[PDB]
């Protein structure tokens, strides 16, 4: 189906404890594939997926230079933003940036992204048109004026429409045996008495990839959104994901409840019931 590539970057200042920490990771869909941490003993961008390992030494050198250079620009920017916000050198502050591309099943660009945050709130974002900016406050307006002068939006457009889509296409092919083979969830329904008159039904989805899934309880064919406890999808740590949904039901009314599972790895959406 559709695919994505994203780079995430975080710098955190630490007054009195040396220079800011910089951490960046790269993903293809939900698969982590590269990482860099400025606090590593000898910092280099490193592989985290087997299909990226085939990239040559020139690839790793370039990626590492970019990460180091980005770490430096974020250090400068943290100092600049203290001036923009009239903040003291006493506190820890955070810069985040994410960029990347979404493509359709044909590998054509659907949407490009480039967006930033300061202390966990929107700072400046490239609009979907890839030619204009949304600046969140008066500080980000200063950045917007600088970036308009330097035609940053036009340069991001060229990157996102070109390099981003093409490298994504390359990675998808190189990693096809794992990236383009959806693992459907393994599913089961459990039953847990609370008292003599009620019980919990929990619908489980395990070992699935990608992370996107819909898990819903229905009673008599109607969605029970209000009464459903639904946990955040969570990583198993082996590149697959886990999720559950639970409802509390009257004793003996269990057959009225069906759990509905949608995931791209399933031939057909599932309808599950508790089997006594």
């Amino acid at each position: 189906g559709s695919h994505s590539m994203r780079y995430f970057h975080t710098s955190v200042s630490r007054p009195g404890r040396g220079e800011p920490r910089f951490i960046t990771v790269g993903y293809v869909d939900d698969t982590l594939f590269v990482r860099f941490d400025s606090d590593a003993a000898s910092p280099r961008e490193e592989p985290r997926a087997p299909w990226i390992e085939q990239e040559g030494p020139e690839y790793w050198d370039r990626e590492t230079q970019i990460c180091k250079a980005k770490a430096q620009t974020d250090r400068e920017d943290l100092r600049t933003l203290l001036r923009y916000y009239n903040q003291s050198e006493a506190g820890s502050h955070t810069l985040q940036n994410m960029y990347g591309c979404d493509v359709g099943p044909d590998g054509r660009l659907l949407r490009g992204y480039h967006q930033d945050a300061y202390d966990g709130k929107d700072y400046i974002a490239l609009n979907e048109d890839l030619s204009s900016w949304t600046a969140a406050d008066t500080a980000a307006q200063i950045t917007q004026r600088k970036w308009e002068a330097a035609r940053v939006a036009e340069q991001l457009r060229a990157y996102l429409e070109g390099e981003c889509v093409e490298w994504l296409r390359r990675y998808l092919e190189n990693g096809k045996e794992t990236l383009q083979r959806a693992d459907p969830p393994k599913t089961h329904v459990t039953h847990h008495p609370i008292s003599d008159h009620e019980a919990t039904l929990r619908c489980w989805a395990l070992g699935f990839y990608p992370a996107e899934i819909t898990l819903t309880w229905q009673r008599d064919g109607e969605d029970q959104t209000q009464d459903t406890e639904l946990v955040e999808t969570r990583p198993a740590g082996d590149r697959t994901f886990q999720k559950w949904a639970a409802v509390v039901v009257p004793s003996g009314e269990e057959q009225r409840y069906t759990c509905h599972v949608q995931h791209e790895g399933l031939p057909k959406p599932l309808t599950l019931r508790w089997e006594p």
Binding site: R62, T73, T80, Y123, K146, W147, A150
Partner: peptide
């Protein structure tokens, strides 16, 4: 593959 060019805020 990452973008090479960088700009200060």
């Amino acid at each position: 593959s990452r973008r090479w060019r960088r700009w200060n805020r």
